[PDB]
Symmetry: D2
Subunit: 328 residues, 4 copies
Amino acid sequence: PALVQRRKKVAMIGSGMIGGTMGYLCALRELADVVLYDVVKGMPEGKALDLSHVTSVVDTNVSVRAEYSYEAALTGADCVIVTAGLTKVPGKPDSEWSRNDLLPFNSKIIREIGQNIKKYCPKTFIIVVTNPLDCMVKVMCEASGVPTNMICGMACMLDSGRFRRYVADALSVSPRDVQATVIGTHGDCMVPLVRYITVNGYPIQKFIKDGVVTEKQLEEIAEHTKVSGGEIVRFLGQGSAYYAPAASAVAMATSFLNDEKRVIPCSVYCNGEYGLKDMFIGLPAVIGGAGIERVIELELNEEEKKQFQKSVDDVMALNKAVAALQAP
Amino acid sequence: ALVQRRKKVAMIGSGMIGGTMGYLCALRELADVVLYDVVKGMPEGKALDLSHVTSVVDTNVSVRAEYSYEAALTGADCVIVTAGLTKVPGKPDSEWSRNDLLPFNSKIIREIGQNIKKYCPKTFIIVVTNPLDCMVKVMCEASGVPTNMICGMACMLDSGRFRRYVADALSVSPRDVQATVIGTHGDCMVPLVRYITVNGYPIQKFIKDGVVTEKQLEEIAEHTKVSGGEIVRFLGQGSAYYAPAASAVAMATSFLNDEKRVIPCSVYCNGEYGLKDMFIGLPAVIGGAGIERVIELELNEEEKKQFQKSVDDVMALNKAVAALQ
Amino acid sequence: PALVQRRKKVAMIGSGMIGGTMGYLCALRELADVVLYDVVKGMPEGKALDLSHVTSVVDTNVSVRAEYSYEAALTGADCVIVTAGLTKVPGKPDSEWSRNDLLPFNSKIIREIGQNIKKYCPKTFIIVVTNPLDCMVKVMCEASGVPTNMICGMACMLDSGRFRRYVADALSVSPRDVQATVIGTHGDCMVPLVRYITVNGYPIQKFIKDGVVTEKQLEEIAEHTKVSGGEIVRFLGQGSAYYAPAASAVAMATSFLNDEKRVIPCSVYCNGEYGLKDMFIGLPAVIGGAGIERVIELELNEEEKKQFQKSVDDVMALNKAVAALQAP
Amino acid sequence: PALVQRRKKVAMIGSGMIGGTMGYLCALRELADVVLYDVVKGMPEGKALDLSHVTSVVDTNVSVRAEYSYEAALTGADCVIVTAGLTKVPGKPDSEWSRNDLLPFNSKIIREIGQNIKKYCPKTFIIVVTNPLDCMVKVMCEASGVPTNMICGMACMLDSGRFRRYVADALSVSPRDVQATVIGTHGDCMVPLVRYITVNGYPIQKFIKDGVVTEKQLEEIAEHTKVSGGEIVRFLGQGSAYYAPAASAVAMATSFLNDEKRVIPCSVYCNGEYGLKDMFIGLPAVIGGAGIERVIELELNEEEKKQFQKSVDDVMALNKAVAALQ
Ligand SMILES: CC(=O)c1ccc[n+]([C@@H]2O[C@H](COP(=O)([O-])OP(=O)(O)OC[C@H]3O[C@@H](n4cnc5c(N)ncnc54)[C@H](O)[C@@H]3O)[C@@H](O)[C@H]2O)c1
Ligand SMILES: CC(=O)c1ccc[n+]([C@@H]2O[C@H](COP(=O)([O-])OP(=O)(O)OC[C@H]3O[C@@H](n4cnc5c(N)ncnc54)[C@H](O)[C@@H]3O)[C@@H](O)[C@H]2O)c1
Ligand SMILES: CC(=O)c1ccc[n+]([C@@H]2O[C@H](COP(=O)([O-])OP(=O)(O)OC[C@H]3O[C@@H](n4cnc5c(N)ncnc54)[C@H](O)[C@@H]3O)[C@@H](O)[C@H]2O)c1
Ligand SMILES: CC(=O)c1ccc[n+]([C@@H]2O[C@H](COP(=O)([O-])OP(=O)(O)OC[C@H]3O[C@@H](n4cnc5c(N)ncnc54)[C@H](O)[C@@H]3O)[C@@H](O)[C@H]2O)c1
């Protein structure tokens, strides 16, 4: 008979570590049918077969397929999660790893994908993952032409996730009950908001006063959060983090697909908030069935504003450079 | 030959909340379940129905009714007690009061505690029976368990109500609303409006941004305080059970899986706020060692006043029980 | 901004034990927004409040609301699960409890609800629970006017669930790995297919030959399955089973909402199966996004056909009676 | 306060593709604390950090740690899942990929791990994944000395999963409702039991008669199942399957840890089934809190017996080869 309830469809544009991992979460949770697309042929088909086998093992039913063209991959996608691009610059020491160095390699890839989203699924919700994140979300926004509430970048949920894990270990509590947020650009200028940390809404200052943790410990945790990505790159040897990045992107996609209205910090379009316009930066936001439904403006004190401003400068300079170098 | 044994949770009281908690256990494959009650037949009916659920949802736990304390309690990793009454016989809904349940619920709780002492002294006890904070103390005295191994479920429910109302007002998921109620479960409970956060962000900025008003938050705190009576009035008979059951099982799961969740509940006071030898609702950390932390938040003038009234109420009920026996 | 992904909506018409329990599963699983409707004033509002509180406790976000008009309850419903009606005949001994006795009390209620579905949500998937089940599904089909693939009755998943639990206990295996099915009408004439029992696809006959279970043990399990409903009625004293019935109806609703294509025996429309036409009866079926997508016809031996024919004769007689007494 | 309820602990010995993936499942489901161990330094610490970050993201609380010594990785492990070893033979064309050729490189690795399990966690439940599977489980068995019911190898749940997925696609039903089993030795000689395929317990034969699937189609599906591992190796270019293998191993571990008593085909110790003794081969088994609680012997028809004997010959030759090596 005629299909009345159609499964959601999520397209993974980029089927490397993060793309395959997100496909895994979808199959494991029966969240949506999955399409894997990559410029590398053969590999997506292998992962799609492996992921299709997972559905039997875990008793779920979603279709996982590799698609070779942008048209087949993007058509009908409720959400498109983009991880296409490079993770490290070839021929460079891990000690010198920088997300900003990826700019010249990844801007063109992200722009091309955006042009195809405009053509095949202009109504989709786009979640960008490719680094340098905040810069790439802007490139994607310009190329895809989608409404600004229908595009965001995954980064701060991961940075906040790291921040929360470290605080949870220091306090001996579940990270479910630590609210710690990182805002700003995803990189060395990110801003872990130590002053705002709460444990089930209780101020972290209470735990400092009680003698469970010290300010020094918290600042060390904030620094650890900032260098966590590079730490994993150095330990892995090849590639970068993927389990938590994938879980973060899918958590965001799920808040959209199920209209959950979760409050998740992510790279979002600024139209005045914090005084910024025509750019994307990591800020707390509400993700629901209408995409980015609210961008939360936090009051920042002198030091916080100074840190955030540096973040703002990094991304504004990079965005200008990208605009300057863009092929007509 | 058995190396890994399933956890076992004993529901002492198999009425609305007891059966509902058994359902959560069967749905999540959390633990084997025993349903115990003084009413004959009913627990066997619910145990059968719940055993059928395991097939429907593809899980495998044992759900059985037991009519003896020895069979119900032996081997229990956690005992959740709901045995007792929900309303005073021959009393109007507009006169419903949790404190009026102190009469014989007190003897019921004492008997159960004596049996836990005998059959599963190493268990973690979660009391639900009203008047909650008062009954937890009776249970602690009768059972003899370490003070970190007993608590009462109340504030997670009150906090859940508080959170749902704030979430609706802000249009966000309640997962991201941290709102807490402390004190004694009743008209004197204390909703901590000052401590409401949205994913850790102070509610104060949402007020300034015009998302919610101060009057609206006050109304939400008041609604939280009377939510139980509201449900009692609407149901006509009995009281809430879905959220109370989910709260008790969330607490049991944090213990069984050593999660270390921060959950407000009725806990033993070892000097906090100058309180000793009593239980009252406070934020706590529940892990594999039971209650592992009790948080003593800084209260503002209004909260101190309200909390003192909560304390007066508890100490008076405890005084009353000491009068009975 | 404009809503793009709307949550599914399930209307519980009848907010008694089963209706409230199904609302609970929806809130626990973030499956759908829920509406509780009943002719009893007040009670649905109390349950809706309780269930809304559950969403905070378990960290989900769905709307649970009570509605007192058919229009508010049914409009926009992706799936309608109907439990409205009596469970026992007033003043009759539990020893004489019979689902068929409920016929004159529940037929008018089911017809009225169907007439409202026809007006308010003609594209919904209807799952009837009200007894006597197979007769009520037919009344609902005629009254609602929905396509025959968009209506079914929940019974055999429950009967089979019971059958499976008893066999799983006998073999000391998880019921996940016991496939046991009951077909026919939900009542004393239901047919537990002992011959078809499998353990992860392996025939039960091998477990008999190897001494794990006996023929009598299996016959007693089938008998226990048939009398399970009444056994619970007698133990409870008031009302009938609700936890497993609720889980079964929601499992069926989920297979439709998520287009899972699970194989679940349920009361479905017959268009030739066993020479049966214009009636509903419990049979294995595939439930997907297009509703009942396939009705499975099993080969029955002499004894099975005899038992099934008895089921058929009972429901056909009752369906004729109901039609003869229907208000003009 | 003294700890009363301790989380389960699962040790992943081998932190490559499958080991890290299994750690992911544990973190996502809050199944157990996880230890990642590997001979490669650095990488396990990187994966452990990444996985610890996942717990915050998905609101769970388990500890994920890398450990570089056997003592630290194995002590207190309720279950040990072993993937340590090689996936492909260096300098060997993918067109020539063979699990059997991995024997000389992995036999010593597995024996060493087994000796360490004996020393540090003799009461653990061992799940072996390293290829050639049935052969490696026997090596693990001899080296660890654990009770015969506390060791098994993961392979047939994965092969059956593939089998089930293809049948589910052909029938347009959820694979939850397809019961299809592969028994024997994990390799080109595995035995997909077509005759034992059921759809929620209903014989596949009726679906053939109803015209939903043909007999030829079912045979093609059995063939596809046999060559699925190599099909993925071919497409991937480097490495082999890991998502479904990881999910299968963890499903087995979960059936043990929560005493679920699921019926899962896996490589188990034979006490006379099919006249097989002192060896492991893939057979339907019940996995519960007492480990392998039952091994199911199915009646085989002529064709199935012929195919199964080839499976038996395959593993017996491998075990003979190992006895000759070490
Ligand atoms: C923002 C944040 O928190 C975060 C975290 C981790 C990684 N990342 C970035 O996410 C991206 C992917 O990481 P990964 O998955 O580990 O990397 P990796 O495993 O290398 O996969 C990237 C994949 O994209 C493919 N690809 C390259 N060019 C194209 C193209 N033009 N079109 C389609 N596919 C293409 C490539 O073949 C490869 O399979 C990188 O840019 C990372 O730096 C961001
Ligand atoms: C603290 C909090 O938030 C909260 C919320 C909701 C209900 N409660 C209380 O929880 C309790 C149970 O509520 P309910 O389940 O809805 O009530 P209900 O459905 O009446 O069940 C209580 C059950 O306990 C049984 N019982 C009575 N005496 C004994 C005894 N000596 N031993 C064993 N069982 C006995 C009784 O037969 C009945 O089945 C009541 O005291 C409620 O007031 C507390
Ligand atoms: C088929 C099967 O397996 C199965 C299993 C269990 C129960 N049932 C039946 O399911 C039905 C519901 O059982 P229950 O929930 O336990 O019963 P119960 O708790 O009594 O609730 C039925 C509800 O329907 C309400 N109701 C009555 N008339 C109307 C009306 N005109 N419009 C709207 N609501 C109305 C009534 O007020 C009550 O709240 C009964 O008919 C049972 O026999 C079937
Ligand atoms: C039975 C079955 O169905 C199945 C399916 C897929 C893979 N496998 C096998 O499973 C194994 C793991 O596959 P993978 O994870 O993809 O491979 P891979 O990613 O290469 O990881 C194997 C890991 O083991 C490590 N290792 C090597 N020697 C030792 C040692 N002595 N001690 C500790 N660690 C060591 C190695 O450094 C690497 O990190 C291989 O043997 C595969 O052939 C079996």
